[PDB]
Write a protein that binds this ligand. Structure first.
Ligand SMILES: OC[C@H]1O[C@H](O)[C@H](O)[C@@H](O)[C@H]1O
Ligand SMILES: OC[C@H]1O[C@H](O)[C@H](O)[C@@H](O)[C@H]1O
Ligand SMILES: OC[C@H]1O[C@H](O)[C@H](O)[C@@H](O)[C@H]1O
Ligand code: NA
Ligand code: NA
Ligand code: NA
Lengths: 721, 721, 228, 246
């Protein structure tokens, strides 16, 4: 039985296989249990209350009750708890609050913060509503915890109401916190860098505070809003994992603090850096949605839980189980140097090899012959496109291809008519020179006029043209914050920017619900669950090298479903790494993702074209297995490994892709075991026709044979008889 | 379906959940698979045959078939395989053999080497008989692999026949070998030292050879005949473990070799050191039984598999499920300084506290007033015992106690009538002074006259007295090997000694099947599965300190059932460690084993006696749970841990013992989760009457509370309602 | 030879066996070397300036100079450096400052913040005085680095002057920062707890941010103001 | 205690300033007092080592390192407390048994030797001691009067660190012609070879006379071969080696 239950002083938030049990103790809310389902909880694992030195008390006479030593679900500073706080509100002469629980309600169905991405398909959910008040400050803080009947995930967010007659300022307001009992833990995060996105990091929890965060105005290339707190010694197949994640695409922080007693606090939310929020009387503030997800089946288990939850409750229903088109994109193929002739010749070749969608990338608008001008001027360059965008689109459609288009709406070049008409629309500080990045500026989406303009320009673009797909890019981070009429309004502008973006993209994606929108930020500079609420795929990385893609795809699909993960066969030598890779390997690596092509098909040999046509025919077959099927990591491309191997199961189909980075010699062949098969199943291997029991494939495994050479790959395709 | 199957060139040895699949390849036997059950095996994990440099070939023209690169089940030297060999036989001018498979048979039921401890209860077993021959040398080597229908264990041994007309010499002959595929592995062994027995060691497998071995004539304090080859990252609950073990109590070797290609060979058997075996025409030689056991449920899984197999197929049926008596032993209590009065007063106090069995230790025979004389003279000292042993025994029986007696049959003092009558019975080298150890010598049990004498003396002792229990000690290792009439007969004498011991103890234990025999060797100097075939319990260690016992008991019950593991409450300060421990903690630690008492009850206060009476009443209750129940390690006392915790389940009863070594301060309480409960079960905690669901106890766990102090312990007792 | 030396665009802060070498690069102060004594430093270990994605620039046309990628001795937010800042001052509608080096002086002997504990026995010391200004905000930030002739230690502190006609608010102002080159490092700290003070902790440096801190009003039982 | 409930400013900004202003007020106070009364030895304290930093050590030349006065629990505390700070700063007291914090019996000899790796004092009721215990204490005091220059003025060398896993601690001090070494073992061990303990920073050619046995060892022997460390059976045993360079 799942949902919310209130029994005496206990609150039970019950998702499938995941319970959060909270106790009301005289106004204070204690985290009793977070983990596997428990009914009729008694308190075997209760904190033993004793006098802890320097851990202070709400009353004079009881030294054993301390907010420094109790496990909690939100953190305040100044009442005796010295752990890192998650709510901090300035009012009058202080930023001490003392929010006390007053009342609980339960809601059924749809529920979420206004203007921030939140879960959908919520018919079978219930939400615990915990109403807290600071009577002196006259503030209300309301916590929400939502159950899901079909996933081991709980969703959370809060609402802060100013019921006083004076202005108050929110300084910190995270979206989820949990105090976990002293024990040995490890953490897993996704970090990395541009062209190295989502690098999987694992380390031991140590005394002190560990954090990942963005102060860039976007979640960023180098950190993902995710933190996995793991049982010591967790593996792919075994052990407890708690993933906390944030549905937000702006500045965030995730931290783990291990305090003086060995207790462990984890939290995620809006970054305190570059954030303050003014509330006038009667105004309120809602935080982004945080998710806490659980598995006791190790790192594969958490992957599956997180992927499943994304697919069912985050990614747009219109797309979450829809095969995605195999595309050609011209960016690496031509850069800025193209025109109508070139485009339609590329389109001809794409059709011949069986590609489905043609994406026109950067350079079709305004004066955009390089990356030094024209952002902001979303006006079709008819000279370059050899006529109207309508005529080009019809041309593409007539060749039997869907049509896609690149945009970068959040950006403005100094050299643009937009900047000449409205220089004040750029994020800037009065009396400071601009800071430049790719020689462009960011638009102030905190300015309602900016949002109105972009809504209008883009709505006009989509209504007047038969566009099947949008690539929505964003190629720099935010500097020079100073557009407020006050310091406080500047402190608010980074989050207001995000509200403006979400107003924009939710409007557009919903109004034009047949267009597939792909998010982008110099690749994976903003690949988070905030964006994935509206954009069902993402350009995982500008690094399209087959070998460099291995760790990137490992991280990019770690918590996010494979269907989201754009991956393109590109030219050699690779433009980022300076590396030759076999076309076969570029093919197999991209086919572990959402397959496209990004090279000049017109400059290929007849042989290369044939190979490409064969790759496309293969993937049309594999596409349901890869995009709709279940992913199993078999060998991880971590910082030390010389190999990668990923399996997908989908009904009667099982495929395995194996890649070896460096050639080896006088080294026994790897033995590669498959997972999650029927022991008694009979599995026919396409390449040799041999039939193997699932037991053989899982328990004995495949001797993996390769010729001599770097960056070789192979694929095994099985059909269950 | 379990048993043996022969299908074309494959042999299937199928125990419950464990298969060994061997292929006959033109006379050569290849290890195809060892692990989880596979039917209709095709060969997905076959060795890829290629030319490996310096790996030579049986024929000129095929460079790809090499015994250096094939996975095998026995190893020879000189045919191209350079891995460590497991059979090596001198004949004529060479020790090259080339044993080729000729014929397979299958046996049903009882089967084993004559004169060596082997499995019992074999009705539901089948044995694969692989007959190999070296036609040139005229030798037969027969391999046996036995299935078990009720355990994931396979048993193995070999028989070597000399069918030539000349003498041949066995130099090496191990009992089991397996070549495992290149992969990352760890190994776990039980090593340690006197008063530190069975220390659990874990390490990574590295290129080269790792070995544990005894050349002491007994398996020894410092190494156990066991080696666990583990999947990288195995835990208590998860991952693959293969345990190879030897039913032998003499010199053994276990090795892991990782070769030039990263392949891994493991083997166990009689140590090549101190071993050669002459075979005249028509003579044969059988190796001790090796066991290979498997789990995919981690280290707890291998413990359970190994324990279960011991209980059902090794330990005497008369005792394997029989509660063992709570004993008093006088050794630490009085040493050599006792007489009738003292003994019967000790006996009186033992009865008052509810002890069941009284064991008279060292010093009752011949001239044995210290440890410098009288071994060999098994003549009752009537003066010291204040009359006949019959009168003492009746006295003990009348006080309501069973009666037990210490012996050391394998030993002879220089100062003894035995040595004066037969100085040549001692193991010695002509013209070399004795090497002494505890100022005693070892008897040559390779001498049939020695075995005949001991059979006679001891049979007389047991037939003429109502003895309920025997403690069979053995207090030194073997030096000065030189009793053969030839060098070859000396090389044979260490194994012949073991054959003589097994002839002796099998005879005696079988003839007097109502006596409980407890094995001993300065504690755990010979605690192996060879001895456990005849002695259903063992004195785990002379170290009776409650805290020092924690790692000892951890190792001592790692592969062996708790019922085997003798543990005594002893005096403080502890005689080995110089340490004060709480009587409560001495109690709880000993009650994780087979409980006895070894201190002078007559010198105890009335309070101490009461405590002891309460401990005895408690254990009478716990005894079925501990001795008959299932053991779950919850916190391991390894080299770094400050804690130990062990759980036992038995039907409706669950108990947990927790010990903390050093006092801690300003440190959050440990959270201790129980295992293997019914999630929906309701578990009533005796101490507080609270009822907890199994889910709560497994997933939330117990906050463990202790006062300030070293060596504190507590026990939690649960009844499932 | 120990003390402070100013040679063209390099500043040498020279304690016994420990040098801090800073370069003035058009107003920006770069950490060139912190470690064992080097005279006549050329720049073997200079940051290689290249275009790093999303690492922005003070001018439109030069993509290779980024405060996100240069090694520095104090950190600001909002000029392209996204590393954790060490000075952050609210003025008017912003907390963007852009402090640029204007002038260096050298002091001899006793020197330190008023009303805060500072070193004594300073006869054989010299102090580098780096005067920075944000002309728009009308703020001065002055950095001090003090040499010691008898120890491998350098002391540092800063002074922030409000030369504007409006109130300003300091939000962050640390006392020392250094950007060290990419390499494998470990850190040692003293943490622990009441009745467990100064527990020596050692761990590997990992991507992300590790911190110890007190918000208790005292440095505290559980952390010491030290990082190795 | 630590600071809670910040709200004494007339504005939010003045409250935000009050924690640092507090520190300025403390430093004004203690600098004034310590300077005005420059003959008084001031020892800082905060439930032991709750504020043991270089800010306080500017005015207070010693600090009560920890309220935990257990000889064994003191090992990791003293390791950290003298890690960056000189031994002379580090207050350490022989206290009663069972220890008030740990609930532990320790040998008086070990309580003595551990405290003498710090700045020695006593914190127990001398009036409730036996005549023997008093004699032992008088001997400890006579010893430390001798060791005090070496410990407080000399150079400290960690030889075995009491980290989270170690069963041992050993610290050496050199001061001119004097070298001392203190060794402590936490848990009793059995059938374990004796530790070999090498000394540091000696003259290779120096001749070092060991007080307890009169034997003279070259610095080379002591640094490169080292001392076989012998103890009886038991927990929390300690010994000291005292050397004079001839
Ligand atoms: O400027 C065009 C270019 O912009 C970013 O770098 C994108 O991630 C690329 O895929 C491409 O669209
Ligand atoms: O000599 C008597 C003595 O012998 C060995 O040491 C045993 O292990 C002890 O239990 C005791 O029986
Ligand atoms: O209250 C008195 C007490 O105060 C603190 O706990 C100190 O650290 C102790 O040494 C003692 O002075
Ligand atoms: Na919403
Ligand atoms: Na037998
Ligand atoms: Na000062």
């Amino acid at each position: 039985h799942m949902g919310v239950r209130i029994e005496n002083n206990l609150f039970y938030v019950e998702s499938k296989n995941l319970s959060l049990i909270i106790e009301n103790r005289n106004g204070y809310l204690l985290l009793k249990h977070l983990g596997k389902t428990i009914k009729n909880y008694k308190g075997s694992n209760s904190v033993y209350e004793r006098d802890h030195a320097f851990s202070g008390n709400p009353t004079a006479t009881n030294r054993t009750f301390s907010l420094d030593t109790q496990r909690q679900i939100f953190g305040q500073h100044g009442l005796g708890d010295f752990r890192k706080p998650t709510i901090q509100v300035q009012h009058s002469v202080t930023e001490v609050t003392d929010f006390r629980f007053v009342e609980a309600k339960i809601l059924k169905g749809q529920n979420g913060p206004q203007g921030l991405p939140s879960p959908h398909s919520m018919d079978d959910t219930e939400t615990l509503v915990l109403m807290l008040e600071d009577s002196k400050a006259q503030l209300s803080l309301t916590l929400y915890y939502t159950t899901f009947n079909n996933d081991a995930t709980i969703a959370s967010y809060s609402k802060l109401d100013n019921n006083s007659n004076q202005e108050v300022v929110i300084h910190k307001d995270f979206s989820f916190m949990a105090d976990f009992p002293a024990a040995d833990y490890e953490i897993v995060t996704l970090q990395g860098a541009y062209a190295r996105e989502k690098t999987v990091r694992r380390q031991q929890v140590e005394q002190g505070i560990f954090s990942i965060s963005s102060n860039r105005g976007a979640s960023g290339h180098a950190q993902t809003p995710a933190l996995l707190l793991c049982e010591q010694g967790v593996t792919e197949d075994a052990g407890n994992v708690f993933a906390i994640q944030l549905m937000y695409s702006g500045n965030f922080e995730a931290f783990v603090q291990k305090n003086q007693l060995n207790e462990v606090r984890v939290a995620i939310g809006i970054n305190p850096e570059n954030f303050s929020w003014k509330l006038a009387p009667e105004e309120y503030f809602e935080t982004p949605v945080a998710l806490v997800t659980h598995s006791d089946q190790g790192l594969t288990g958490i992957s599956h839980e997180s992927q499943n939850f994304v697919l069912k409750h985050i990614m747009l229903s219109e797309f979450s189980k829809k095969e995605r088109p195999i595309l050609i994109n011209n960016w690496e193929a031509t850069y800025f140097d193209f025109q109508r002739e070139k485009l339609l010749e590329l389109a001809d070749e794409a059709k011949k090899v069986g590609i489905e969608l043609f994406v026109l990338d950067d350079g079709w608008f305004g004066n955009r012959f390089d990356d030094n001008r024209a952002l902001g001027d979303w006006v079709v360059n008819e000279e370059k496109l050899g006529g109207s965008l309508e005529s080009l689109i019809s041309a593409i459609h007539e060749r039997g291809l869907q049509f896609g288009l690149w945009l970068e709406p959040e950006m403005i070049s100094v050299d643009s008519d937009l900047y000449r008409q409205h220089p004040d629309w750029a994020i800037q500080v009065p009396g400071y020179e601009h800071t430049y990045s790719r020689n462009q500026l960011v638009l102030n989406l905190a300015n309602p006029q900016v949002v109105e303009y972009l809504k209008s320009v883009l709505d006009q673009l989509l209504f007047y043209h038969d566009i099947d797909y949008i690539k929505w890019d964003m190629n720099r981070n935010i500097t020079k914050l100073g557009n407020g009429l006050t310091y406080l309004e500047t402190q608010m502008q980074s989050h207001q920017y995000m509200l403006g973006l979400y107003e924009l993209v939710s409007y557009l994606t919903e109004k034009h619900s047949h267009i597939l929108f792909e998010s982008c930020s110099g690749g994976g500079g903003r690949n988070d669950l905030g964006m994935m609420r509206y954009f069902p795929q993402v350009w995982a990385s500008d690094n399209t090298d087959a070998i460099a893609r291995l760790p990137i795809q490992y991280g990019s699909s770690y918590l996010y479903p494979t269907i989201s993960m754009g991956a393109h066969v590109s030219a050699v030598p690779n433009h980022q790494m300076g590396r030759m890779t076999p076309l076969e390997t570029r093919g197999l690596v991209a086919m572990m993702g959402n397959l496209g092509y990004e090279l000049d098909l017109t400059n290929l040999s007849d042989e290369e074209k044939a190979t490409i046509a064969n790759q496309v025919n293969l993937y049309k077959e594999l596409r349901p297995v890869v995009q709709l099927g279940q992913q199993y990591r078999l060998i991880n491309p971590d910082t030390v490994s010389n190999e990668a191997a990923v399996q997908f199961n989908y009904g009667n189909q099982t495929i395995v892709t194996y890649v070896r980075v460096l050639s080896v010699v006088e080294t026994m062949e790897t033995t590669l075991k498959l997972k999650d098969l029927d022991e008694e199943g009979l599995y026919k291997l396409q390449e040799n026709g041999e039939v193997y029991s699932g037991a053989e494939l899982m328990y004995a495994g495949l001797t993996v044979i390769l010729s001599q050479g770097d960056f070789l790959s192979r694929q095994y395709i099985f059909r269950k008889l």
